[PDB]
Design an enzyme around this catalytic site. Structure first.
Site, short mmCIF file in Angstrom:
data_model
loop_
_atom_site.label_atom_id
_atom_site.label_comp_id
_atom_site.label_asym_id
_atom_site.label_seq_id
_atom_site.Cartn_x
_atom_site.Cartn_y
_atom_site.Cartn_z
N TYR A 60 -2.76 -23.64 -2.91
CA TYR A 60 -2.51 -23.64 -4.33
C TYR A 60 -1.14 -24.30 -4.57
O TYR A 60 -1.03 -25.20 -5.40
CB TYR A 60 -2.58 -22.23 -4.94
CG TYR A 60 -2.15 -22.21 -6.41
CD1 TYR A 60 -3.03 -22.58 -7.42
CD2 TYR A 60 -0.85 -21.88 -6.77
CE1 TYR A 60 -2.66 -22.54 -8.75
CE2 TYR A 60 -0.46 -21.86 -8.11
CZ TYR A 60 -1.38 -22.23 -9.12
OH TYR A 60 -1.02 -22.25 -10.47
N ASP B 274 0.35 -14.62 -16.12
CA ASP B 274 1.65 -15.20 -15.78
C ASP B 274 2.52 -15.35 -17.02
O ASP B 274 2.21 -16.16 -17.87
CB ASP B 274 1.47 -16.59 -15.15
CG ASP B 274 2.80 -17.21 -14.69
OD1 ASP B 274 3.86 -16.57 -14.85
OD2 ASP B 274 2.79 -18.32 -14.11
N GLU C 160 6.55 -25.47 -6.56
CA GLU C 160 6.44 -24.14 -5.96
C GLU C 160 6.73 -24.18 -4.47
O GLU C 160 5.98 -24.77 -3.73
CB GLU C 160 5.05 -23.56 -6.17
CG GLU C 160 4.67 -23.43 -7.65
CD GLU C 160 3.71 -22.26 -7.99
OE1 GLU C 160 3.45 -21.38 -7.11
OE2 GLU C 160 3.24 -22.22 -9.17
N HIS D 285 13.08 3.42 -2.18
CA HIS D 285 12.03 3.95 -1.35
C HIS D 285 12.36 3.69 0.10
O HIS D 285 12.23 4.59 0.95
CB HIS D 285 10.71 3.29 -1.72
CG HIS D 285 9.58 3.69 -0.83
ND1 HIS D 285 8.54 4.50 -1.25
CD2 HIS D 285 9.32 3.38 0.46
CE1 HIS D 285 7.71 4.69 -0.25
NE2 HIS D 285 8.17 4.03 0.81
N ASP E 237 -2.24 2.26 1.33
CA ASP E 237 -1.48 1.59 2.36
C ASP E 237 -2.29 1.65 3.65
O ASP E 237 -2.51 2.75 4.20
CB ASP E 237 -0.19 2.31 2.60
CG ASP E 237 0.58 1.74 3.78
OD1 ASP E 237 0.19 0.73 4.37
OD2 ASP E 237 1.65 2.30 4.10
N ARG F 242 -4.93 7.25 -1.65
CA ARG F 242 -4.44 8.63 -1.37
C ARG F 242 -3.80 9.13 -2.65
O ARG F 242 -3.27 8.32 -3.40
CB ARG F 242 -3.43 8.55 -0.24
CG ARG F 242 -4.12 8.01 0.98
CD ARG F 242 -3.29 7.03 1.77
NE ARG F 242 -2.52 7.64 2.80
CZ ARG F 242 -1.93 6.99 3.80
NH1 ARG F 242 -2.04 5.68 3.98
NH2 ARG F 242 -1.19 7.69 4.64
N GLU G 274 12.49 0.43 7.38
CA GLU G 274 12.06 -0.53 6.40
C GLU G 274 13.21 -1.36 5.79
O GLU G 274 14.04 -0.81 5.08
CB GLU G 274 11.36 0.24 5.29
CG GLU G 274 10.08 0.87 5.72
CD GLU G 274 9.45 1.73 4.65
OE1 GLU G 274 9.89 1.66 3.48
OE2 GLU G 274 8.50 2.45 5.02
N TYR H 292 5.08 -6.56 5.07
CA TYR H 292 4.20 -6.23 3.95
C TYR H 292 4.93 -6.33 2.62
O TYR H 292 6.13 -6.45 2.60
CB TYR H 292 3.68 -4.80 4.12
CG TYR H 292 4.65 -3.64 4.03
CD1 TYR H 292 5.34 -3.22 5.15
CD2 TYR H 292 4.77 -2.88 2.88
CE1 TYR H 292 6.17 -2.12 5.11
CE2 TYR H 292 5.61 -1.77 2.84
CZ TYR H 292 6.29 -1.39 3.96
OH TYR H 292 7.13 -0.31 3.95
C1 LIG Z 1 -0.17 10.03 8.20
C2 LIG Z 1 0.48 8.67 8.56
C3 LIG Z 1 -0.50 7.68 9.24
C4 LIG Z 1 -1.45 7.15 8.24
O1 LIG Z 1 -1.02 6.84 7.15
C5 LIG Z 1 -2.87 6.93 8.60
C6 LIG Z 1 -3.70 8.06 7.99
C7 LIG Z 1 -3.28 5.53 8.10
O2 LIG Z 1 -2.39 4.50 8.63
C8 LIG Z 1 -4.69 5.18 8.54
C9 LIG Z 1 -4.70 4.86 10.05
C10 LIG Z 1 -5.21 3.96 7.84
C11 LIG Z 1 -5.42 4.06 6.35
C12 LIG Z 1 -6.36 5.18 5.94
C13 LIG Z 1 -5.77 6.22 5.22
C14 LIG Z 1 -6.50 7.30 4.81
C15 LIG Z 1 -7.85 7.36 5.08
C16 LIG Z 1 -8.66 8.53 4.60
C17 LIG Z 1 -8.43 6.33 5.77
O3 LIG Z 1 -9.76 6.41 5.99
C18 LIG Z 1 -7.72 5.21 6.21
C19 LIG Z 1 -8.45 4.09 6.93
O4 LIG Z 1 -8.03 2.94 6.92
O5 LIG Z 1 -9.53 4.31 7.50
C20 LIG Z 1 0.10 6.44 9.89
O6 LIG Z 1 1.21 5.89 9.16
C21 LIG Z 1 2.16 5.39 10.08
C22 LIG Z 1 3.41 6.22 10.05
C23 LIG Z 1 4.44 5.64 11.00
C24 LIG Z 1 2.53 3.98 9.67
C25 LIG Z 1 1.32 3.05 9.59
C26 LIG Z 1 1.77 1.70 9.04
C27 LIG Z 1 2.48 1.77 7.69
O7 LIG Z 1 1.49 2.16 6.76
C28 LIG Z 1 3.02 0.36 7.38
C29 LIG Z 1 3.34 0.08 5.93
C30 LIG Z 1 3.57 2.85 7.72
C31 LIG Z 1 4.77 2.37 8.48
O8 LIG Z 1 3.15 4.06 8.39
C32 LIG Z 1 1.53 5.59 11.48
C33 LIG Z 1 0.54 6.71 11.32
C34 LIG Z 1 -0.64 6.72 12.29
#
Ligand SMILES: CC[C@@H](C(=O)[C@@H](C)[C@@H](O)[C@H](C)CCc1ccc(C)c(O)c1C(=O)O)[C@H]1O[C@](CC)([C@H]2CC[C@](O)(CC)[C@H](C)O2)C[C@@H]1C
Ligand code: NA
Length: 274
Positions: free
Chosen positions: A17, A41, A68, A140, A164, A171, A191, A245
């Site tokens: 784009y 925009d 751009e 944050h 996320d 959530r 972060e 991200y």
């Molecule tokens: C409770 C925290 C945990 C978490 O958020 C899990 C539930 C999610 O990352 C899961 C794996 C993927 C997203 C998801 C959320 C909720 C439900 C019900 C889901 O079905 C899913 C899914 O994708 O299937 C994870 O978050 C992390 C915490 C260090 C990281 C993951 C990566 C991150 O989201 C990056 C922005 C952030 C840094 O957090 C690792 C940890 C395993």
């Protein structure tokens, strides 16, 4: 066969784009949009809907030699989203983040360009609300870095809905957010905020984030959810995972974050060893 386009394809469409806007050929630009595509925009104004109305909006900008300069694109796991920060020059420099949805034909179905008066050199109108929102996005990250979960929650409404990565479950509630941030702190998440922009809709802002965290447990967890694929680290107890991200936030009438999305896909993850 109908299929949604892959992360790599969406990233490339967003860059393309920019290359076509820069090449100055309107017909080239229009063929990248779906016939009934929507452009907003700046975020906060009325959508421009369909190729005719897009031709009317873009024609003048291409005659004025808009340019751009794309940054790094970010994907998602929803089969459609890509986010691209850019610097738009024309007199004027504006920093923007385009939130784009690419459809099943490879064409841009939707494009929402977030930028505020305070992201733009061509207007000095004050927008203290813009600056407050950008500062909340940055905040944050500081509160995650400092391990201050209670403080992080103070920024968020009890009605918070967050996703996320984009493409997973939405959530809801302070308890789910508490559980996320408590895990981040346990995985020594850091972060580092990069570019911020605001919307002009009294509500949105966005921040690029570069995040590192311990390889264990996030790597194996996330690999098993098919959200990333990393090489095996020489030392998994010392290795880190990087995720680039963009976090988009929506702020309610009371100044509290009630919506938040983190845009990253498998192509935005890496192994840092050590
Ligand atoms: C409770 C925290 C945990 C978490 O958020 C899990 C539930 C999610 O990352 C899961 C794996 C993927 C997203 C998801 C959320 C909720 C439900 C019900 C889901 O079905 C899913 C899914 O994708 O299937 C994870 O978050 C992390 C915490 C260090 C990281 C993951 C990566 C991150 O989201 C990056 C922005 C952030 C840094 O957090 C690792 C940890 C395993
Ligand atoms: Na400005």
């Amino acid at each position: 066969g109908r299929h949604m386009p892959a992360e790599t394809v969406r990233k490339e469409v967003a860059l393309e784009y920019c290359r076509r806007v820069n090449a100055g050929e309107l017909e080239g630009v229009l063929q990248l949009f779906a016939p009934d595509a929507r452009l907003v925009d700046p975020l906060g104004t009325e959508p421009v809907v369909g190729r005719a109305a897009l031709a009317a909006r873009l024609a003048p900008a291409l005659r004025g030699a808009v340019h751009e300069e794309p940054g790094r694109p970010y994907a998602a796991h929803d089969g459609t989203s890509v986010v691209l920060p850019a610097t738009v020059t024309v007199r004027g420099r504006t920093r923007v983040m385009g939130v784009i949805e690419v459809g099943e034909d490879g064409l841009i179905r939707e494009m929402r360009v977030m930028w505020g008066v305070t992201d733009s050199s061509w207007t000095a109108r004050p927008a203290p609300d813009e600056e407050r929102r950008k500062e909340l996005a940055r905040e944050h990250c500081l509160r995650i870095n400092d391990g201050d979960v209670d403080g992080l929650l103070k920024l968020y409404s009890p009605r918070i809905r967050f996703e996320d990565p984009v493409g997973s479950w939405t959530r809801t509630g302070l308890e789910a957010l508490r559980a996320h941030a408590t895990m981040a702190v346990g995985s020594n998440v850091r972060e580092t905020a990069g570019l911020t922009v605001a919307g002009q809709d009294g509500r949105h802002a966005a921040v690029t984030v570069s995040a590192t965290m311990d390889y264990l447990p996030s790597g194996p967890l996330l690999a098993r959810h098919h959200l990333m694929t990393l090489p095996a680290p020489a030392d998994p107890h010392r290795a880190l995972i990087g995720i680039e991200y963009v976090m988009v936030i929506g702020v309610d009438a009371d100044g509290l974050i009630d919506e938040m999305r983190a845009y990253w896909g498998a192509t935005d993850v890496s192994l840092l060893d050590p």
